[PDB]
RNA sequence: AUAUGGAUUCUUCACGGUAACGUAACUGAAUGUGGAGACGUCGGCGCGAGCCCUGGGAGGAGUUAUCUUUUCUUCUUAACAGCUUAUCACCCCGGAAUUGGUUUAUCCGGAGAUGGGGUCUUAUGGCUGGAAGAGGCCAGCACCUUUGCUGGCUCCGGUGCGCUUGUGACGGCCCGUGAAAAUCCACAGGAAGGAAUAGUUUUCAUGCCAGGUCGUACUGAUAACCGCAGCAGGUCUCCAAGGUGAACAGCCUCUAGUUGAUAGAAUAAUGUAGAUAAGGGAAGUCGGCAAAAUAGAUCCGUAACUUCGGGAUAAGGAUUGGCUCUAAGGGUCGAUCAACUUAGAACUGGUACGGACAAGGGGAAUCUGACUGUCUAAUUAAAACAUAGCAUUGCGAUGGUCAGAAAGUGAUGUUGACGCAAU
RNA sequence: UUCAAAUGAGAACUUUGAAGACUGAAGUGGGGAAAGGUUCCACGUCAACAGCAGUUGGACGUGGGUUAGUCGAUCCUAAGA
């Protein structure tokens, strides 16, 4: 229900002591004037709100996954 | 048998009315054994129950008739049942024309072709039914500027 | 009612007409040593009250139903 | 830009009741370009190899038009009861027996 | 109607339970003269009038 | 219930903007003031939503003797959240007759217009999150089976005196000016409480707990209600597709729903209901009762009388199809794009054309009530009642008219002679 | 209204399929207020009831079914009591 755009803020939410679950969604969509690319959405389940971070760079996306805390339960697709 | 309840369940499951549900007349025994909605879904999957197509309501003649009207046909005195006001209100015609005239006067004044003093005179003449269309106003402006 | 036990993890009871949801939740915990997520109740057309008691995920309604005797 | 449409006729041809050459000739004299037929002035080109019929056009052409012409060809030869025009993926079609 | 007070619903509940045939085994008791329920009610014939 | 983060304080209770005012926050008791709740009806105009119509493309289905790049169908996006979006209104600069601006509708300006630059309400719309993982449409595989598995696509536009509905700014009308309260907020006020080795803010953010009781099925009517009944009666309301046409008219169709009302055979008289008639045309009859004639639209033409508003569609005439063309009436920026409106001309036919449906007979006078309105539910709708207008009567409150067994009792009266009451 | 099949001791009237039609969006469509009170749903079943018929039913017999912090009541006041 809420979207965040700052990656530094995203990491703070993942260790907020009330977050237990998260999911990663992959979307195959097209860009403005080119061939389709890969879009990934990182969703953090808070107590009262769901936070969504969307990044359209696949190279920058893989680094975010490796940086997620291990204690967080992550759901794939 | 009595398949009244099977047809009702099939219509709800498929999502159409009971008039669009077809039950296989050669599969009465297996249809009678389908009491749940899960069993109805299986019968739809294997073709025992099918959804009939909608009855066609073509608009081919409507489209062809509309094309004839766009060419000026079927518009004589023998085809009119309402009054001229009922077909097209005279107030609607007036509002279109006055908005056309006022839109042109503002365009010319902004473009610098007409000063505000001549604009004000022509503003109240158009309101006074002086000009019958846009062409009459443009010609009047040319004559005023030519003198 | 039995379909709600193994599928919905919900126990169905007939309760007294004078009992509210607070008392129903307390009675189930004391009698059966389980945790109650929520209670839904209705008054049946025959004049008796029926309660839908859903247990938490930490308990299985089917195991509790077998222990009771049904 | 140009668009390419391919029709797979392998299955009907293997039986022997279908002729890709005759079907390819039907599309030459029945495609209308900006009006009537016979206006394939370097706009519509159809090529066959015995198993796949490939149509390349730069004018107004669509999959619905290709299926409409194919169904007319199948009905003319009385093949509708056995052969069906099916779209496998985008702009790639095949005939099912 | 769907909107009904508790008193009306409780009244309707009792009338439903009283509308049943007499058990068969009762007619076999010693000195029994009761054959059929003389207070049977049908919703379309006789109205409750509450 | 409470903690952390943020904000604030050594100038103790925040800063920016000329201003309209802006913000993540940014002490406020008694008491007081203000706002919201909170409001008629009709008319046109602007805008939004759903629906309707329609172009390209990706799928499925129908038709195919012949014709039809064709006919039908799927292509969807909730509450909520972030950013953004406005007619009206307001602020700053400036100082107007050669008066300007401006609405379909004539209103505004030295009590500051036009113009340039700003601020604000968020009805409403746009993008994103919710959210494709859902739903929808197809294709390829397994198979008594608990029944699934794997794939694709779900896209981009146009149009308006359209329909329904919401809403905004205005205008018309009244001897009619079209509820109340619970409840929530703001302001004025300054009682108190508060900092330096420390505190306050739960009107900023995040986190924790709980939310009882009763109703909830179904019919909603030519079979579930009331009329003695499964009675052609009676019974409040929301949603509303295409064509014809002025139209929620009549007539035909799509979605959805029904195909129910004892049947079969025959076709006498008399009926009930629907119709047609040669010549005459009210001679019928208490009486033109009933029926017939007239009928839409466009153009022409229209008397006596009159309270000058009417009479009036007075009366009385002409025209109307189909087809092929022509002229005029627009938007955005020479070019390019898009609406049905009206007028006219050839050609064509068994002279037909509001071709079904739909749809005024008219005129000259007398009696009577001015008009619209109202009543004898179940035999009388009228000339009867009412009405505006006119006149008369009573009364200045310790009062007039009227109520009550009584009353430390009431109606007019939340009233005061331009009033109330009685004819 | 018609043809065929299925069921049954028995079919103009039940079920399914096919055909012909109607309501024609101010409906014979889709929801409700009042009123009714289990008529709702499944299984079993036809003596009586459905002014013919009946294997069908709003009939007869036995069971099943109405889940709310957010929809209403509850709270407020209106004429009035
Ligand atoms: Cl009920
Ligand atoms: Cl006769
Ligand atoms: Cl008079
Ligand atoms: Mg006008
Ligand atoms: Mg006018
Ligand atoms: Mg409840
Ligand atoms: Mg019964
Ligand atoms: Mg319900
Ligand atoms: Mg009754
Ligand atoms: Mg009754
Ligand atoms: Mg009675
Ligand atoms: Mg005659
Ligand atoms: Mg004659
Ligand atoms: Mg005579
Ligand atoms: Mg005589
Ligand atoms: Mg008559
Ligand atoms: Mg009168
Ligand atoms: Mg009138
Ligand atoms: Mg009478
Ligand atoms: Mg009468
Ligand atoms: Mg009188
Ligand atoms: Mg009083
Ligand atoms: Mg009809
Ligand atoms: Mg019809
Ligand atoms: Mg039933
Ligand atoms: Mg009978
Ligand atoms: Mg019988």
Curated annotation (Swiss-Prot), chain A:
Any further remark recorded for this protein: Present with 50200 molecules/cell in log phase SD medium.
GO cellular component: cytoplasm; cytosol; cytosolic large ribosomal subunit
Protein name: Large ribosomal subunit protein eL38
Protein family according to the UniProt entry: Belongs to the eukaryotic ribosomal protein eL38 family.
Subunit structure: Component of the large ribosomal subunit (LSU). Mature yeast ribosomes consist of a small (40S) and a large (60S) subunit. The 40S small subunit contains 1 molecule of ribosomal RNA (18S rRNA) and 33 different proteins (encoded by 57 genes). The large 60S subunit contains 3 rRNA molecules (25S, 5.8S and 5S rRNA) and 46 different proteins (encoded by 81 genes).
Residues that span the membrane, as ranges: none
Subcellular location: Cytoplasm
InterPro entries assigned to the protein according to its UniProt record, in alphabetical order: Ribosomal_eL38, Ribosomal_eL38_sf
Species of the source: Saccharomyces cerevisiae (strain ATCC 204508 / S288c)
Keywords (A to Z) from UniProt: Cytoplasm, Ribonucleoprotein, Ribosomal protein
Function: Component of the ribosome, a large ribonucleoprotein complex responsible for the synthesis of proteins in the cell. The small ribosomal subunit (SSU) binds messenger RNAs (mRNAs) and translates the encoded message by selecting cognate aminoacyl-transfer RNA (tRNA) molecules. The large subunit (LSU) contains the ribosomal catalytic site termed the peptidyl transferase center (PTC), which catalyzes the formation of peptide bonds, thereby polymerizing the amino acids delivered by tRNAs into a polypeptide chain.
UniProtKB/Swiss-Prot annotation, chain B:
Keyword Ribosomal protein: yes
Assigned keywords, A-Z: Cytoplasm, Isopeptide bond, Phosphoprotein, Ribonucleoprotein, Ribosomal protein, Ubl conjugation
Record-listed Phosphoserine modification sites: 29, 36, 90
Region (Disordered): 57-84
One GO cellular component term: cytosol
Keyword Ribosomal protein attributed: yes
Family: Belongs to the eukaryotic ribosomal protein eL19 family.
Compartment list: Cytoplasm
Oligomeric and partner information: Component of the large ribosomal subunit (LSU). Mature yeast ribosomes consist of a small (40S) and a large (60S) subunit. The 40S small subunit contains 1 molecule of ribosomal RNA (18S rRNA) and 33 different proteins (encoded by 57 genes). The large 60S subunit contains 3 rRNA molecules (25S, 5.8S and 5S rRNA) and 46 different proteins (encoded by 81 genes). eL19 lies in close proximity to the binding site for eukaryotic initiation factor eIF4G.
Note: Present with 97700 molecules/cell in log phase SD medium. There are 2 genes for eL19 in yeast.
UniProt cross-link Glycyl lysine isopeptide (Lys-Gly) (interchain with G-Cter in ubiquitin), position: 20, 52, 59, 145
Superkingdom of origin organism: Eukaryota
Predominant localisation class: cytoplasm
Gene Ontology terms: biological process: cytoplasmic translation
Range covered out of full length: 2 to 148 of 189
GO MF terms, alphabetically ordered: RNA binding; structural constituent of ribosome
Basic residues: bias regions: 58-67
Protein name in UniProt: Large ribosomal subunit protein eL19A
From Swiss-Prot, chain D:
Residue intervals passing through the bilayer: none
Location of the protein in the cell: Cytoplasm
GO molecular function, one term: structural constituent of ribosome
UniProt KW keywords: Cytoplasm, Ribonucleoprotein, Ribosomal protein
Biological process according to GO: cytoplasmic translation
The UniProt record lists the keyword Cytoplasm: yes
Function (record text): Component of the ribosome, a large ribonucleoprotein complex responsible for the synthesis of proteins in the cell. The small ribosomal subunit (SSU) binds messenger RNAs (mRNAs) and translates the encoded message by selecting cognate aminoacyl-transfer RNA (tRNA) molecules. The large subunit (LSU) contains the ribosomal catalytic site termed the peptidyl transferase center (PTC), which catalyzes the formation of peptide bonds, thereby polymerizing the amino acids delivered by tRNAs into a polypeptide chain.
Note: Present with 60400 molecules/cell in log phase SD medium.
Protein family membership: Belongs to the eukaryotic ribosomal protein eL22 family.
Protein name as it appears in the record: Large ribosomal subunit protein eL22A
From Swiss-Prot, chain E:
Highest rank taxon of the organism: Eukaryota
Sorted UniProt keywords: Cytoplasm, Ribonucleoprotein, Ribosomal protein
Ribonucleoprotein is among the record's keywords: yes
GO molecular function: structural constituent of ribosome
GO biological process, one term: cytoplasmic translation
InterPro entries: Ribosomal_eL39 (IPR000077), Ribosomal_eL39_CS (IPR020083), Ribosomal_eL39_dom_sf (IPR023626)
Protein localization: Cytoplasm
SUPFAM superfamilies: Ribosomal protein L39e (SSF48662)
GO cellular component annotations of the record: cytoplasm; cytosol; cytosolic large ribosomal subunit; extracellular space
Subunit structure of this chain's protein: Component of the large ribosomal subunit. Interacts with IMPACT.
Family statement: Belongs to the eukaryotic ribosomal protein eL39 family.
Purpose of the protein: RNA-binding component of the large ribosomal subunit. The ribosome is a large ribonucleoprotein complex responsible for the synthesis of proteins in the cell.
Record-given protein name: Large ribosomal subunit protein eL39
Organism: Mus musculus
Organismal lineage: Eukaryota, Metazoa, Chordata, Craniata, Vertebrata
